Paper text:
It self-associates in oligomers through a central oligomerisation domain (POD) and bridges the RdRp and the nucleocapsid. Here, we used X-ray diffusion and diffraction experiments to provide a complete structural analysis of BoDV-1 P. We observed that P possesses a modular architecture, consisting of a central oligomerisation domain (POD) surrounded by two disordered regions, similar to other Mononegavirales Ps. Using X-ray diffusion and diffraction experiments, we revealed that BoDV-1 P adopts a long coiled-coil α-helical structure split into two parts by an original β-strand twist motif, which is highly conserved across the members of whole Orthobornavirus genus and may regulate viral replication.
Crystals were obtained for the POD of munia bornavirus 1 (MuBV-1; 77% sequence identity with BoDV-1) and Gaboon viper virus 1 (GaVV-1; 41 and 43% sequence identity with BoDV-1 and MuBV-1, respectively). The structure of MuBV-1 POD was solved by molecular replacement using BoDV-1 POD as a starting model, whereas GaVV-1 POD was obtained de novo using Se-Met derivative crystals. For both MuBV-1 and GaVV-1, the asymmetric units contained a tetrameric POD, whereas the tetramer for BoDV-1 could be obtained after applying the inherent symmetry operations of the tetragonal space group. MuBV-1 and GaVV-1 POD presented similar architectures composed of two α-helical coiled-coils (the monomers being parallel) linked by a kink. Globally, the only differences concern the relative spatial position of the two coiled-coils, due to the inherent flexibility induced by such a break and the crystal packing. MuBV-1 and GaVV-1 breaks were also composed of three residues, with a strictly conserved aspartate in the middle. The Ramachandran analysis showed that all of them fall into the β-area, with neighbouring residues at intermediate positions; this confirms that this specificity is conserved in all Orthobornavirus P. Using the Vc determination on the diffusion data, the MW were estimated between 40 and 45 kDa, 12–16% lower than the theoretical values, all corresponding to tetramers. The three X-ray structures fit perfectly with the SAXS data.
Author numbering:
A (entry chain B): 72 to 166
B (entry chain A): 72 to 170
C (entry chain D): 72 to 168
D (entry chain C): 75 to 169
The structure:
Amino acid sequence: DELIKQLVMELAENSMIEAEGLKGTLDEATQKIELGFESLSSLQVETIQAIQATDYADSIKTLGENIKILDRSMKSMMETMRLMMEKIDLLYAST
Amino acid sequence: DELIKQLVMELAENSMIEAEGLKGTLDEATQKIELGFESLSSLQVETIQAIQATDYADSIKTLGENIKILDRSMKSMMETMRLMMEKIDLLYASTAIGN
Amino acid sequence: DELIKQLVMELAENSMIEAEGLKGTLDEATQKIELGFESLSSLQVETIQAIQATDYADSIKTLGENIKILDRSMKSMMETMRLMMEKIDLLYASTAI
Amino acid sequence: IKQLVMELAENSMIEAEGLKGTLDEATQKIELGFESLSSLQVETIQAIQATDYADSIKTLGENIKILDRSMKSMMETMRLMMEKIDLLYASTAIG
């Protein structure tokens, strides 16, 4: 009666202490989950933005353009060297 | 007594409020986790796809071919210039020593 | 009365219903956190490998090695052109009018 | 009865520490996921930021432009060489 009254009031004290404990921890876990996904998402966007920045499709276009220019300069040199070879042959023949 | 019945009825009522309060907070936490992993996982998949579909390799190949072609031509031009030097040498020796 | 018996037998049986409800959800949640980070870790490793396999530093390397060879042919031609001009100038002393 | 209640208090004490232990374990499995994945993301970003080669390709473009200038200047030197050969030829019996 007085012992059963102690038991029940003990249950209600210990239950609500435990219920609080578990509540407080869940809130901490919820803060943890919110911040953790906020950071993973931020770094995932930085990854995409860093890959975006590393674009060098334009570097390659420009390099290919200077190679074609050197190619055209080389073809003129070869033409010039054919004409020079002929003037050498002429001079030697004409000595 | 009516005391123990009132203590139990109060205990029972509060226990179910705390339990349903815990249950809902755990479901909200589980829902958040699921949506967290779901959303990040979608964007990482699309990140891998888009990396895989880049093709600079094709372009670096072409440039390497075009440089091999320039290299072959320059070896050809070095041969022409050796012959040109030999013909100049023959002109020099033959006019100097002959004449 | 059996009204103290009933109310408690009810609170005992459904508070155990609740507790298993929580234990079961907490055991799902845990399993999901594990399979979650396993999934993102694996995708992140696959990201790093997708990047590594589109790293062409070595292909650019070879490109640069091959441009160094053109440079060395150009150096060789420029030296031959220097010697040639000197031999042509020497013709001005040896070639009769 | 005193027993109906006393068993409840114990079964509820143990279910409770049963729960707090799986929770604190989840709370830590979560700190380790975020710490682990986040540093793996930092790696990834750092392995993109070490992998930029727009400058590498620009440098090769510059090497090509230097070769083009030497090629064009050799062509102007050989056109002088041709003028020198023509003058010599102009001076022979035949030219």
